[PDB]
Design an enzyme around this catalytic site. Structure first.
Site, mmCIF file in Angstrom:
data_model
loop_
_atom_site.group_PDB
_atom_site.id
_atom_site.type_symbol
_atom_site.label_atom_id
_atom_site.label_comp_id
_atom_site.label_asym_id
_atom_site.label_seq_id
_atom_site.Cartn_x
_atom_site.Cartn_y
_atom_site.Cartn_z
ATOM 1 C CD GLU A 1 -3.131 -0.526 -0.015
ATOM 2 O OE1 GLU A 1 -3.036 0.441 -0.704
ATOM 3 O OE2 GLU A 1 -4.038 -1.412 -0.244
ATOM 4 C CG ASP B 1 -13.216 8.751 -5.530
ATOM 5 O OD1 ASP B 1 -12.199 9.267 -5.182
ATOM 6 O OD2 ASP B 1 -13.797 7.806 -4.849
ATOM 7 C CB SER C 1 -11.443 10.002 -2.126
ATOM 8 O OG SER C 1 -11.026 8.865 -2.872
ATOM 9 C CG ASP D 1 -6.306 5.817 -1.132
ATOM 10 O OD1 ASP D 1 -7.409 5.966 -0.771
ATOM 11 O OD2 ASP D 1 -6.017 5.204 -2.192
ATOM 12 C CG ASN E 1 -10.873 6.605 -0.006
ATOM 13 O OD1 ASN E 1 -12.062 6.962 0.033
ATOM 14 N ND2 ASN E 1 -10.056 6.955 -1.001
#
Length: 129
Positions: free
Chosen positions: A35, A48, A50, A52, A59
């Site tokens: 990640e 979108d 958003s 992370d 998120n």
């Protein structure tokens, strides 16, 4: 902070993540590797709108507030920047809410694609825990 594999394993362990909801330590370490490459400062924006944040790439659409994701729910009740700290406590607490939520670790796309069904125990091999 860029953690070492074993140093992170030991911190996650200390934070109650080993076997949390039936997911062994190696799953959590594998997910952090893929990640964020173990870097607490990792951010990545999504299509979108958003973003992370942190070691576990949490998120801003659902879990934290970053002031720029319209329609964010803030389920972990924290500013997203808290998730970037050298102290992983807030990321871990928030992850525990996420994994309890229904699809388990499948919430983490890298986990599903790169960890799931692999010998995740390899991730904690040689560590003093």
């Amino acid at each position: 902070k860029v953690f070492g594999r074993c140093e992170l394993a030991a911190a996650m362990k200390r934070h109650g993540l080993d076997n949390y909801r039936g997911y062994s330590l190696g799953n959590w370490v594998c997910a952090a590797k893929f990640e964020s490459n173990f870097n607490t400062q990792a951010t990545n924006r999504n299509t979108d709108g958003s973003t992370d944040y942190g070691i576990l790439q949490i998120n801003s659409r659902w879990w934290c507030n970053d002031g720029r994701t319209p329609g964010s729910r803030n389920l972990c009740n924290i500013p997203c920047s808290a998730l970037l700290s050298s102290d992983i406590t807030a990321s871990v607490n928030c992850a525990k809410k996420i994994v309890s939520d229904g699809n388990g670790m499948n919430a983490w796309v890298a986990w599903r694609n790169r960890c799931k069904g692999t010998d995740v125990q390899a991730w904690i091999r040689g560590c003093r825990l």
